[PDB]
Amino acid sequence: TDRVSVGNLRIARVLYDFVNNEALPGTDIDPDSFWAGVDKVVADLTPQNQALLNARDELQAQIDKWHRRDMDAYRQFLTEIGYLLPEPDDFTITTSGVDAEITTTAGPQLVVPVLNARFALNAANARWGSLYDALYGTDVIPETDGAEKGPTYNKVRGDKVIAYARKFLDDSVPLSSGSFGDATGFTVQDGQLVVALPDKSTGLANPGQFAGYTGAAESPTSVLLINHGLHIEILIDPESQVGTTDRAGVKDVILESAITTIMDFEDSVAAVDAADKVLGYRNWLGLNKGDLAARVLNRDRNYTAPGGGQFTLPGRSLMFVRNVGHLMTNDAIVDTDGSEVFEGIMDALFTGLIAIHGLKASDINSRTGSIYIVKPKMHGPAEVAFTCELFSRVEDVLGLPQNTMKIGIMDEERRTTVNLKACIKAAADRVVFINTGFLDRTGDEIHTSMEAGPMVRKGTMKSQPWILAYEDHNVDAGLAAGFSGRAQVGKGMWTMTELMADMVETKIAQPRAGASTAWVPSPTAATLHALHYHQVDVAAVQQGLAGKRRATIEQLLTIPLAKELAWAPDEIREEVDNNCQSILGYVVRWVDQGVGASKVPDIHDVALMEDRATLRISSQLLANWLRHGVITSADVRASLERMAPLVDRQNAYRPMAPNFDDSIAFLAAQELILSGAQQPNGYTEPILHRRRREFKARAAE
Ligand SMILES: O=C(O)c1ccc2[nH]ccc2c1
Ligand SMILES: [Mg+2]
């Protein structure tokens, strides 16, 4: 083959070479030791990896049987089989060497496919983002009559943007008197910010919010403010398009936006072989070496402190990498038997290895010496413990100090949810966040209780008692584990990329709920979501939540079973079409173009940023409805066939219709549903991976 033999492993040459030529140089890690380490770690941890996965299946089968055959009983049952484990005594996480962006700063956290270097670079650079751009460019400023986005600058719209931002300034960094809306100028005197108004001048109600400035104190080019640990920069440039129209010559308001970014190897990317992984790893590498270029990485920002000294602010989002979970294998490395190696294990090794570059001078990431790995899709504390051991073992291979590799725990599986405290405990010295991956979580919810009855509709799930309890329980567990000031308590993604007005109105709920972070899909969204952290004092919210237990185990365990006869035929139809459309729209680009996250229009034409989890939900929901006779297989087929041409229309593209059964992507979509009930925990990867690989193969001959 085109493989490299290393002990029991046969490493894809492309990966082998990548690692030797790109990833290893500069790390002082002995290549042979590295590779011997790979082999050893893989041999050592693979069996437990498999055991854990088997354990998921065993638990699921027992739960399946339980339904096929009442809270106290169900709970008692979950406890007997070891699904529901004892909650450990209170503890405080001890995680150290974590950067301020994670321990302290509350703000947006951007998640981006690492395979898309353009996007990844944009994300890394999204630490700072133009508020005017975010406002003008999205519907946060309604495109009502006269204020629409035109081919060119609409002054009326620009004025609304300006006014929006002035109000934001007033609300975030209040003047002692008057409104920023009436500022005619900014100056710095005696290290104090002085805002010129028509009738007089004023300072900030809290001078401490004056963070700095650029240019001459007496006609600064910008003024830097801080509020809730987040920076705001008023750019002053009368001789600019927008500045010329502005009463104080203000060109823009720049917000510190994506404080952190998750470079995603998991649900937002399609990587099914060594070539894919290598592309991912190489972007991750370029990000860490600071030399990724599509466009380049921002340098730090220079400011003059209020007193006149000089200082610097991070110009880049602090990067996490999201590794894949324990489930999938990838033929990037196979053993002598030809068995694919566990991809999670590999990610730990390679992203960890690669991350070392981000810990050192770039011809840079964590100044405190941590590598931040988000671990998705874990089920329960043993799986968390396993990830920690994996990290521990990788750290050894990489010659890294123990606990350098921090873990961002996704709480997005039910068995993690109801054992969240134990999971956090398992990673007490590595955990830098917990996050409610509510989409996967819903997928898991459905699969876990697949046999219980028909589930409520997809759109209903977001408001179901289990998920609201899950959201609160997550925050409670983090806060009780001392996350406040130590680790992020994070919440899920806003997926409606075009519904920014909506995001600004509603996503504020997450910091209000004590989330020191939440996920946005884009730099723009990060900037807008930043607004929320100016309005909400997350530190205070968290302090106020301390000691609260706002969710009971019973609530967490409240299966979202649909009430008897819940839906009219048209509602069932729409739900089926809804799900088939999103499955097809997502899958076709996954399978055909190896794109793992896309703005897929939905049934109502709303642009959703679909990642794999949305696929997990839809396919599981459909599988669940099919399982319980809500819909028939013909209903599914009809909807797939009906929705397919639309998806074909909504799209370098291979149409699915009319010859559906020649379309691997169409077959994938179908398979995802018809086999949904049999996918472990409803995971879509096995099928997506197979189908994408199949497609790649046909794309060859
Ligand atoms: O992992 C997720 O929760 C998720 C969902 C949608 C997305 N769009 C871009 C990244 C991403 C991640
Ligand atoms: Mg997820």
Side-chain angles (χ1 to χ4, degrees), residues 230-255:
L230 292 179
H231 295 86
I232 300 160
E233 190 173 357
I234 302 166
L235 290 199
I236 305 153
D237 185 5
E239 318 287 48
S240 68
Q241 178 72 18
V242 176
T244 316
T245 74
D246 193 82
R247 290 189 194 172
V250 169
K251 169 176 177 207
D252 205 336
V253 178
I254 311 310
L255 299 185

mmCIF file of all heavy atoms in Angstrom, residues 230-255:
data_model
loop_
_atom_site.group_PDB
_atom_site.id
_atom_site.type_symbol
_atom_site.label_atom_id
_atom_site.label_comp_id
_atom_site.label_asym_id
_atom_site.label_seq_id
_atom_site.Cartn_x
_atom_site.Cartn_y
_atom_site.Cartn_z
ATOM 1 N N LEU A 230 -14.880 43.089 28.021
ATOM 2 C CA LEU A 230 -14.858 43.110 26.562
ATOM 3 C C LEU A 230 -14.564 44.504 26.034
ATOM 4 O O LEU A 230 -15.129 45.507 26.510
ATOM 5 C CB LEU A 230 -16.191 42.618 25.988
ATOM 6 C CG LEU A 230 -16.491 41.141 26.219
ATOM 7 C CD1 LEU A 230 -17.831 40.822 25.638
ATOM 8 C CD2 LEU A 230 -15.423 40.303 25.566
ATOM 9 N N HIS A 231 -13.699 44.570 25.031
ATOM 10 C CA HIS A 231 -13.281 45.859 24.512
ATOM 11 C C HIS A 231 -14.170 46.389 23.413
ATOM 12 O O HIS A 231 -14.733 45.644 22.613
ATOM 13 C CB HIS A 231 -11.823 45.834 24.074
ATOM 14 C CG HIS A 231 -10.876 45.625 25.208
ATOM 15 N ND1 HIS A 231 -10.528 44.372 25.663
ATOM 16 C CD2 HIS A 231 -10.235 46.508 26.008
ATOM 17 C CE1 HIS A 231 -9.702 44.493 26.687
ATOM 18 N NE2 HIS A 231 -9.507 45.779 26.915
ATOM 19 N N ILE A 232 -14.308 47.703 23.411
ATOM 20 C CA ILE A 232 -15.073 48.394 22.407
ATOM 21 C C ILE A 232 -14.153 49.463 21.868
ATOM 22 O O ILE A 232 -13.514 50.184 22.637
ATOM 23 C CB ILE A 232 -16.271 49.102 23.040
ATOM 24 C CG1 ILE A 232 -17.193 48.093 23.730
ATOM 25 C CG2 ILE A 232 -16.991 49.924 21.998
ATOM 26 C CD1 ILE A 232 -18.137 48.745 24.782
ATOM 27 N N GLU A 233 -14.067 49.582 20.554
ATOM 28 C CA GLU A 233 -13.192 50.602 20.020
ATOM 29 C C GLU A 233 -13.937 51.503 19.082
ATOM 30 O O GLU A 233 -14.483 51.065 18.068
ATOM 31 C CB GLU A 233 -11.986 49.994 19.322
ATOM 32 C CG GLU A 233 -10.938 51.043 18.957
ATOM 33 C CD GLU A 233 -9.665 50.418 18.425
ATOM 34 O OE1 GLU A 233 -9.592 49.172 18.391
ATOM 35 O OE2 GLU A 233 -8.744 51.164 18.039
ATOM 36 N N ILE A 234 -13.957 52.776 19.428
ATOM 37 C CA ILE A 234 -14.578 53.752 18.575
ATOM 38 C C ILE A 234 -13.505 54.234 17.639
ATOM 39 O O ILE A 234 -12.528 54.824 18.076
ATOM 40 C CB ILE A 234 -15.112 54.935 19.380
ATOM 41 C CG1 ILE A 234 -16.126 54.447 20.422
ATOM 42 C CG2 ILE A 234 -15.720 55.950 18.443
ATOM 43 C CD1 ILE A 234 -16.466 55.471 21.507
ATOM 44 N N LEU A 235 -13.683 53.961 16.355
ATOM 45 C CA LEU A 235 -12.749 54.411 15.343
ATOM 46 C C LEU A 235 -13.156 55.801 14.898
ATOM 47 O O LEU A 235 -14.291 56.018 14.479
ATOM 48 C CB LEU A 235 -12.751 53.471 14.136
ATOM 49 C CG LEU A 235 -12.146 52.091 14.353
ATOM 50 C CD1 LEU A 235 -11.793 51.452 13.011
ATOM 51 C CD2 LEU A 235 -10.911 52.230 15.211
ATOM 52 N N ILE A 236 -12.212 56.731 14.971
ATOM 53 C CA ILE A 236 -12.468 58.113 14.616
ATOM 54 C C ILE A 236 -11.764 58.474 13.331
ATOM 55 O O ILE A 236 -10.540 58.481 13.265
ATOM 56 C CB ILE A 236 -11.969 59.038 15.713
ATOM 57 C CG1 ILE A 236 -12.599 58.621 17.039
ATOM 58 C CG2 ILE A 236 -12.276 60.498 15.362
ATOM 59 C CD1 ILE A 236 -11.765 58.982 18.242
ATOM 60 N N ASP A 237 -12.542 58.774 12.304
ATOM 61 C CA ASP A 237 -11.975 59.124 11.018
ATOM 62 C C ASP A 237 -12.986 59.893 10.183
ATOM 63 O O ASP A 237 -13.678 59.317 9.352
ATOM 64 C CB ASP A 237 -11.507 57.873 10.280
ATOM 65 C CG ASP A 237 -10.793 58.196 8.982
ATOM 66 O OD1 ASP A 237 -10.582 59.399 8.694
ATOM 67 O OD2 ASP A 237 -10.447 57.243 8.251
ATOM 68 N N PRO A 238 -13.079 61.208 10.420
ATOM 69 C CA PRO A 238 -13.968 62.091 9.662
ATOM 70 C C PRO A 238 -13.796 61.894 8.161
ATOM 71 O O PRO A 238 -14.767 61.991 7.417
ATOM 72 C CB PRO A 238 -13.487 63.483 10.059
ATOM 73 C CG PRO A 238 -12.912 63.304 11.428
ATOM 74 C CD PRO A 238 -12.309 61.936 11.445
ATOM 75 N N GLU A 239 -12.579 61.613 7.721
ATOM 76 C CA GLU A 239 -12.307 61.489 6.293
ATOM 77 C C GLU A 239 -12.617 60.085 5.787
ATOM 78 O O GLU A 239 -11.966 59.589 4.872
ATOM 79 C CB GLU A 239 -10.853 61.855 5.981
ATOM 80 C CG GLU A 239 -10.333 63.087 6.726
ATOM 81 C CD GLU A 239 -10.897 64.413 6.202
ATOM 82 O OE1 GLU A 239 -12.136 64.515 6.027
ATOM 83 O OE2 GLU A 239 -10.091 65.353 5.971
ATOM 84 N N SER A 240 -13.610 59.444 6.392
ATOM 85 C CA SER A 240 -14.054 58.138 5.933
ATOM 86 C C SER A 240 -15.504 58.222 5.463
ATOM 87 O O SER A 240 -16.226 59.154 5.813
ATOM 88 C CB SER A 240 -13.916 57.104 7.045
ATOM 89 O OG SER A 240 -14.830 57.377 8.091
ATOM 90 N N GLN A 241 -15.923 57.242 4.671
ATOM 91 C CA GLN A 241 -17.284 57.204 4.161
ATOM 92 C C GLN A 241 -18.290 57.484 5.266
ATOM 93 O O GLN A 241 -19.135 58.371 5.160
ATOM 94 C CB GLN A 241 -17.591 55.831 3.579
ATOM 95 C CG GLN A 241 -19.022 55.716 3.073
ATOM 96 C CD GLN A 241 -19.217 56.509 1.802
ATOM 97 O OE1 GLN A 241 -18.237 56.858 1.134
ATOM 98 N NE2 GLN A 241 -20.473 56.798 1.453
ATOM 99 N N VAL A 242 -18.199 56.699 6.329
ATOM 100 C CA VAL A 242 -19.158 56.798 7.403
ATOM 101 C C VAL A 242 -18.781 57.945 8.324
ATOM 102 O O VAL A 242 -19.642 58.665 8.817
ATOM 103 C CB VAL A 242 -19.227 55.478 8.187
ATOM 104 C CG1 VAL A 242 -20.161 55.619 9.366
ATOM 105 C CG2 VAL A 242 -19.671 54.335 7.255
ATOM 106 N N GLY A 243 -17.483 58.112 8.552
ATOM 107 C CA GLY A 243 -17.006 59.140 9.454
ATOM 108 C C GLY A 243 -17.489 60.516 9.048
ATOM 109 O O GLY A 243 -17.923 61.294 9.894
ATOM 110 N N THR A 244 -17.430 60.812 7.751
ATOM 111 C CA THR A 244 -17.830 62.123 7.248
ATOM 112 C C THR A 244 -19.267 62.456 7.611
ATOM 113 O O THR A 244 -19.604 63.627 7.773
ATOM 114 C CB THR A 244 -17.704 62.235 5.718
ATOM 115 O OG1 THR A 244 -16.462 61.671 5.290
ATOM 116 C CG2 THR A 244 -17.761 63.689 5.289
ATOM 117 N N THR A 245 -20.117 61.434 7.719
ATOM 118 C CA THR A 245 -21.529 61.655 8.048
ATOM 119 C C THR A 245 -21.744 61.778 9.557
ATOM 120 O O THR A 245 -22.831 62.115 10.010
ATOM 121 C CB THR A 245 -22.450 60.521 7.497
ATOM 122 O OG1 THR A 245 -22.292 59.323 8.278
ATOM 123 C CG2 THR A 245 -22.132 60.227 6.037
ATOM 124 N N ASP A 246 -20.698 61.503 10.329
ATOM 125 C CA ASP A 246 -20.843 61.342 11.768
ATOM 126 C C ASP A 246 -20.530 62.606 12.559
ATOM 127 O O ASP A 246 -19.565 63.309 12.269
ATOM 128 C CB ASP A 246 -19.937 60.218 12.253
ATOM 129 C CG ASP A 246 -20.255 59.800 13.654
ATOM 130 O OD1 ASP A 246 -21.203 59.007 13.812
ATOM 131 O OD2 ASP A 246 -19.596 60.294 14.596
ATOM 132 N N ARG A 247 -21.338 62.867 13.577
ATOM 133 C CA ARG A 247 -21.191 64.070 14.395
ATOM 134 C C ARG A 247 -19.867 64.129 15.146
ATOM 135 O O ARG A 247 -19.447 65.197 15.590
ATOM 136 C CB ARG A 247 -22.315 64.170 15.423
ATOM 137 C CG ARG A 247 -23.683 64.460 14.869
ATOM 138 C CD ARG A 247 -24.626 64.751 16.020
ATOM 139 N NE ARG A 247 -26.021 64.718 15.614
ATOM 140 C CZ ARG A 247 -27.037 64.783 16.468
ATOM 141 N NH1 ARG A 247 -26.795 64.881 17.773
ATOM 142 N NH2 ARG A 247 -28.287 64.751 16.020
ATOM 143 N N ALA A 248 -19.225 62.984 15.334
ATOM 144 C CA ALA A 248 -17.944 62.989 16.012
ATOM 145 C C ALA A 248 -16.877 62.379 15.110
ATOM 146 O O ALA A 248 -15.775 62.081 15.556
ATOM 147 C CB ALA A 248 -18.037 62.271 17.347
ATOM 148 N N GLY A 249 -17.216 62.214 13.830
ATOM 149 C CA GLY A 249 -16.286 61.695 12.845
ATOM 150 C C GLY A 249 -16.051 60.210 13.020
ATOM 151 O O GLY A 249 -15.130 59.652 12.435
ATOM 152 N N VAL A 250 -16.902 59.575 13.820
ATOM 153 C CA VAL A 250 -16.787 58.151 14.099
ATOM 154 C C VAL A 250 -17.003 57.301 12.855
ATOM 155 O O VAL A 250 -18.030 57.378 12.193
ATOM 156 C CB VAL A 250 -17.739 57.710 15.215
ATOM 157 C CG1 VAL A 250 -17.785 56.189 15.298
ATOM 158 C CG2 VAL A 250 -17.291 58.314 16.536
ATOM 159 N N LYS A 251 -15.997 56.498 12.554
ATOM 160 C CA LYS A 251 -15.969 55.674 11.360
ATOM 161 C C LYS A 251 -16.588 54.317 11.654
ATOM 162 O O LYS A 251 -17.210 53.713 10.790
ATOM 163 C CB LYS A 251 -14.518 55.484 10.917
ATOM 164 C CG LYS A 251 -14.313 54.430 9.839
ATOM 165 C CD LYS A 251 -12.865 54.366 9.393
ATOM 166 C CE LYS A 251 -12.672 53.255 8.375
ATOM 167 N NZ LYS A 251 -11.282 52.727 8.384
ATOM 168 N N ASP A 252 -16.404 53.837 12.879
ATOM 169 C CA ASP A 252 -16.884 52.513 13.239
ATOM 170 C C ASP A 252 -16.800 52.299 14.727
ATOM 171 O O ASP A 252 -16.159 53.055 15.461
ATOM 172 C CB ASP A 252 -16.040 51.442 12.560
ATOM 173 C CG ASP A 252 -16.782 50.122 12.373
ATOM 174 O OD1 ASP A 252 -17.750 49.805 13.112
ATOM 175 O OD2 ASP A 252 -16.378 49.394 11.459
ATOM 176 N N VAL A 253 -17.471 51.254 15.165
ATOM 177 C CA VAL A 253 -17.286 50.747 16.494
ATOM 178 C C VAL A 253 -16.874 49.312 16.305
ATOM 179 O O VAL A 253 -17.582 48.526 15.685
ATOM 180 C CB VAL A 253 -18.564 50.843 17.301
ATOM 181 C CG1 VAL A 253 -18.348 50.266 18.681
ATOM 182 C CG2 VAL A 253 -18.992 52.287 17.379
ATOM 183 N N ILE A 254 -15.687 48.999 16.793
ATOM 184 C CA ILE A 254 -15.149 47.665 16.702
ATOM 185 C C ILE A 254 -15.397 47.024 18.032
ATOM 186 O O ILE A 254 -15.118 47.626 19.073
ATOM 187 C CB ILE A 254 -13.629 47.698 16.459
ATOM 188 C CG1 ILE A 254 -13.303 48.657 15.316
ATOM 189 C CG2 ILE A 254 -13.102 46.287 16.189
ATOM 190 C CD1 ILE A 254 -14.135 48.417 14.053
ATOM 191 N N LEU A 255 -15.943 45.816 18.003
ATOM 192 C CA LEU A 255 -16.167 45.069 19.222
ATOM 193 C C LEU A 255 -15.221 43.892 19.287
ATOM 194 O O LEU A 255 -15.033 43.162 18.311
ATOM 195 C CB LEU A 255 -17.602 44.548 19.297
ATOM 196 C CG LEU A 255 -18.736 45.565 19.301
ATOM 197 C CD1 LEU A 255 -20.083 44.844 19.515
ATOM 198 C CD2 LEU A 255 -18.490 46.632 20.381
#
